[PDB]
């Protein structure tokens, strides 16, 4: 079931006397006239405090169960009362699934660590909060379904526990020989004080167009006449980014479809620039690549642009692709290419025994065996001088201890998968202070028409309607602007036609009564909104839209102005 | 921590159907291919299945072409086995595994190295009775 | 398919003892062989891969070696938490990856 | 474990000794151990510089005849500013002129 | 009684006010050692 509450759930905010001062404050309350939970049990969400009624002579309410988990593990919150008073105390407990001679407290087993302790019809109420570790609770016990009334609640105890809060349940007496459940939100309200520093009233500032008034004006009593008290803002729903078609193409053809790759030794780097289109258009033909990229997979860096990047493509056998990735050692890593220990692209490797062997033999590709020292990254050597491994000088003739330091694969097509050769594409991306100027794409997405939205075109951020122009741009412009220089303009970059950009009607919004003291009937005027976009009686004047009075073909003297000739009245 | 889920497992007769899930946890799903791996009671392992980061490229053992497919949910981080015309040698422990990348440009085919992560697995019977 | 034969079947050692184990290919794997660990009612985990690169958080005792049609993984001071069956495979052609028959490694 | 073998004529570094160490933490809650104060005495109708519990301010303090509510500290009036405290030792009323 | 070292005993304390140099009173005999903070200064200092 479900119930109503009228007015409940209103504690005093905080210490601080006071006196008759309609004081305006803004907390976490129960709104008025709210939707609560009923019940006659399981475990509930907390979300942001809870207000808690009961209504019973006898005491049917043995305690709450709080935390995040209800379990063991972690510590929670446990609060009793015997026949004797109020038992706060935190611990971590295991509790009973259900919780409940004369014998009693078969809740929990368990009570390790305890970081609190304290000893010492009807209705009950409580409230709940939880605020920078701080449980509040408040409570009253007033004597006497729920009736109708005021009464706020004051503050019970203070615990500095530190406890997080998310579920809680709660705790009943069983027969062996009734409850509310509400939450709090952050509302406004106008409180009414008396001499004696108590709260007598209030008025719930997010309800009535009346309350709105009484709560602007800081009373209860509203006189006749008309008062602006709020505003009317359109939304914008959905975000289209609209964008032009890739320009032009990467040439990375040229370089994975080429006829010859370079020697490791003398590894080939082709340096890309000034060239759109997605990134996982590699990949494509994908199960016999050995695509191995590190740190970020290709969807990641398929919306990801970069200022420059590098294509090295070289030649080695299968064995050795291992090597083509930082942190490894070998004649590759050590002597011909070696990545650094932080790499932030793709490595692509695929096997071209087709291509790159032949029966007699293919001596083209070499690498390079000596070397006095590893390479740093990225480091390119291509000098042919005899590596000196004794202690006479070569004075560059090959000879003892004096080695031509590049050998030669021997490509055969017969060879074993780990001799064969396999041609491998190095993929660095680097970021800098320069624009960046190699990206894929930037997120497909249609276009709406007369409907108020968020938009971006290339680089344009603006929100409003977008609707068919009749200007003419000149053949090089994409955007106009007004007088005072505001954009209200553009032209869609896919199909190149010009839409105007209105705003998304706003106003202010007047409140219409005859007095309090007369009745409680309003009638609100949407200043100059058509009666189309506002979200009976409504009736359209040049001033707006006023909802809520008919319109008579009589004619009075005028009582309460409106505008433009309209006035209105309390009589019939 | 990286934790796989098999589910789906359970009894069928010979030339029925079943499909089993694998999800994945504690890892960037679509940055790795997936495999599925079985083992019959008191036997060895055997490589049944497995698909690419992308789900562009799927192999299959010789012993389950045509009668199994593989296939993966990016968005749900989910790996399936779809097992038609089950024989009483299927039956058997599924392990779904993350594939692993070998030491840097393994060379590999498709994404799929070794398993490098396994789940528990889940128990396929198909028998008659 | 590449079969992958294991020898020994069973290998009988005892705690503090070095245990070697053989993984043969009947075509070259260039080093795409992985060792893997399975424990009775436990998944297989991955010990060495790269024929002997070894997997994160394995300890120092195992090691691998080998390339081309030959392998072996190596415990260097057998623990009692080491007792266990011991898989090869290879992942060198897709598909299909082939497992060894495997070695028990048991108590002597 | 062995064991301590106290006699009492044992030299005093071989002799039992007592000890009590006292570790003070602090985390993301208010200290529930303290107890200060440091002060003098409280005039009446003088022109004092006052400090009730954490409200500095200067004013002459004078008895009063409002009622706080059974929590309530002190009291302020319209436009916001403290114009009445109760006396954390006495617990009386004062307004601040 | 005081426990042995090897199993000392640790008393929690929660939730009492009263002045820290209340301790140090019968003042003349005691080994007194605090570290880094005089008596006096975190006389007016509390803790969780
Ligand atoms: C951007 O690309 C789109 C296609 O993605 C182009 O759309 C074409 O527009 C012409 C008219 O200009 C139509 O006849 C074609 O049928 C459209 N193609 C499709 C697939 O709808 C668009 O013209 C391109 N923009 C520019 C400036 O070239
Ligand atoms: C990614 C892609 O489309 N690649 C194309 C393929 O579609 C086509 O079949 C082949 C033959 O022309 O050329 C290449
Ligand atoms: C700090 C303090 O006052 N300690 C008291 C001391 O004054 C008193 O003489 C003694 C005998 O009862 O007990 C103790
Ligand atoms: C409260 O809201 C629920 C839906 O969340 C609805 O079913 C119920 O009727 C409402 N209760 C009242 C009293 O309007
Ligand atoms: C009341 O409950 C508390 C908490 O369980 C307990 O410490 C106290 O002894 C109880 N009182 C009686 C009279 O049982
Ligand atoms: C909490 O209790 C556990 C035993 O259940 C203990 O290991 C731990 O030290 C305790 N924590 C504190 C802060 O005392
Ligand atoms: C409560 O949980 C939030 C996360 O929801 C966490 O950031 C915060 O530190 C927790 N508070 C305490 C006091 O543990
Ligand atoms: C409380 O207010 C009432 C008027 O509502 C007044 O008659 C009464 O004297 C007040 N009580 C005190 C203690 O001031
Ligand atoms: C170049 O690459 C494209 C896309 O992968 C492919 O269609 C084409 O066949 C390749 N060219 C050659 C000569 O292999
Ligand atoms: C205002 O209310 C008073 C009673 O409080 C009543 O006598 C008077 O007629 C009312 N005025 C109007 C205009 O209704
Ligand atoms: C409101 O918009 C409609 C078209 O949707 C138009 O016919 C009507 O005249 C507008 N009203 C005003 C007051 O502009
Ligand atoms: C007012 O009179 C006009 C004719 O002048 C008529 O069309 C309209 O319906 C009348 N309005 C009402 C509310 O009767």
């Not at chain 1, 605020?131 to 105890?157: C, M, N, R, W």
Request: hydrophobic share 35%.
């Amino acid at each position: 079931a479900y119930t109503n509450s009228f007015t409940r759930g209103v504690y005093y905010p905080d210490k601080v006397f006071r006196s008759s001062v309609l004081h305006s404050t803004q907390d976490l309350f129960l709104p008025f006239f709210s939707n609560v939970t009923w019940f006659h049990n399981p475990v509930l969400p907390f979300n942001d405090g809870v207000y808690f009624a009961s209504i019973e002579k006898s005491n049917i309410i043995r305690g709450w169960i709080f935390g995040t988990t209800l379990d063991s593990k972690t510590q929670s919150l446990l609060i009793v009362n015997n026949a004797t008073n109020v038992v706060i105390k935190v611990c971590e407990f295991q509790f009973c699934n259900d919780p409940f001679m004369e014998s009693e407290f078969r809740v929990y087993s368990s009570a390790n660590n305890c970081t609190f302790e304290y000893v010492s019809k009807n209705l009950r109420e409580f409230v709940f909060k939880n605020i920078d570790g701080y449980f509040k609770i408040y409570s009253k016990h007033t004597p006497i379904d729920l009736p109708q009334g005021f009464s706020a609640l004051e503050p019970l105890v203070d615990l500095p526990i530190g406890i997080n809060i998310t579920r809680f349940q709660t705790l009943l007496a069983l027969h062996r020989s009734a409850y509310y459940v509400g939450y709090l939100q952050p509302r406004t309200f106008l409180l009414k004080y008396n001499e004696n520093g108590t709260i007598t009233d209030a008025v719930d500032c997010a309800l009535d167009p009346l309350s709105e008034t009484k709560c602007t004006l800081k009373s209860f009593t509203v006189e006749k006449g008309i008062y602006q008290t709020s505003n009317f803002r359109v939304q914008p729903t959905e975000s289209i980014v609209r964008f032009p078609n890739i320009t032009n193409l990467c040439p990375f053809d040229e370089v994975f479809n080429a006829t010859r790759f370079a020697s490791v030794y003398a590894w080939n780097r082709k340096r890309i620039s000034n060239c759109v289109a997605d990134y996982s258009v590699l990949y494509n033909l994908a199960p016999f690549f050995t695509f191995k990229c590190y740190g970020v997979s290709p969807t990641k860096l398929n919306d990801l642009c970069f200022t420059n990047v590098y294509a090295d493509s070289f030649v080695i056998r299968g064995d050795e692709v291992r090597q083509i990735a930082p942190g490894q050692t070998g004649n590759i890593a050590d002597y011909n290419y070696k990545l650094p220990d932080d790499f932030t692209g793709c490595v692509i490797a695929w096997n071209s025994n087709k291509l790159d062997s032949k029966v007699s033999g293919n001596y083209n590709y070499l690498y390079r065996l000596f070397r006095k020292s590893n390479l740093k990254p990225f480091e390119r050597d291509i000098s042919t001088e005899i590596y000196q491994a004794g202690n006479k000088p070569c004075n560059g003739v090959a000879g003892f201890n004096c080695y031509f330091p590049l050998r030669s694969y021997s490509f055969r097509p017969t060879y074993g998968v780990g001799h064969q050769p396999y041609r491998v594409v190095v993929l660095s991306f680097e970021l800098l202070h320069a624009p960046a100027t190699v990206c894929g794409p930037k997120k497909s997405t249609n276009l709406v028409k007369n409907k108020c939205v968020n938009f971006n075109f290339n680089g344009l951020k603006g929100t409003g309607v977008l609707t068919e122009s009749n200007k003419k741009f000149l053949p090089f412009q994409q955007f106009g602007r007004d007088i005072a220089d505001t954009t209200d303009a553009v032209r869609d970059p896919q199909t190149l036609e010009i839409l105007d950009i209105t705003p998304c009607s706003f106003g202010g919004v007047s409140v219409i009564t005859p007095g309090t003291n007369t009745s409680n009937q309003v009638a609100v005027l949407y200043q100059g909104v058509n009666c189309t976009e506002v979200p009976s009686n409504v009736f359209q004047t040049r001033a707006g839209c006023l909802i809520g009075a008919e319109y008579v073909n009589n004619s009075y003297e005028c009582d309460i102005p409106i505008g433009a000739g309209i006035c209105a009245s309390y009589q019939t | 921590e990286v934790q796989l889920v098999e589910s789906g497992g359970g009894v069928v007769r010979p030339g029925g159907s079943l499909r089993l899930s694998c999800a994945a946890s504690g890892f960037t799903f679509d940055d790795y291919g997936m495999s599925w791996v079985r083992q019959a009671p008191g036997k060895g392992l055997e490589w049944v299945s497995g698909i690419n980061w992308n789900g562009g490229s799927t192999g299959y053992a010789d012993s389950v072409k045509g009668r199994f497919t593989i296939s993966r949910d990016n968005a749900k981080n989910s790996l399936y086995l779809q097992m038609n015309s089950l024989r009483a040698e299927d039956t058997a422990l599924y392990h779904c595994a993350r594939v692993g990348y070998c030491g840097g440009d393994c060379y590999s085919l498709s994404l799929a190295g070794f398993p490098d992560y396994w789940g528990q697995g889940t128990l396929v019977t198909v028998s008659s009775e | 398919e590449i079969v992958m034969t294991q020898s020994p079947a069973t290998l009988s050692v005892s705690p503090g003892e070095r245990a070697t184990l053989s993984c043969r290919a009947s075509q070259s794997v260039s080093y795409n062989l992985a060792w893997y660990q399975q424990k009775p009612g436990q998944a297989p985990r991955l010990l060495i891969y790269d024929a002997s690169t070894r997997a994160t958080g394995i300890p120092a005792r195992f090691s691998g070696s080998g390339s081309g049609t030959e392998f072996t993984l190596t415990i260097s001071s057998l623990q009692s938490e080491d007792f266990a069956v011991y898989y090869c495979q290879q992942y060198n052609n897709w598909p299909p990856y082939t497992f060894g028959q495997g070695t028990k490694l048991e108590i002597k």
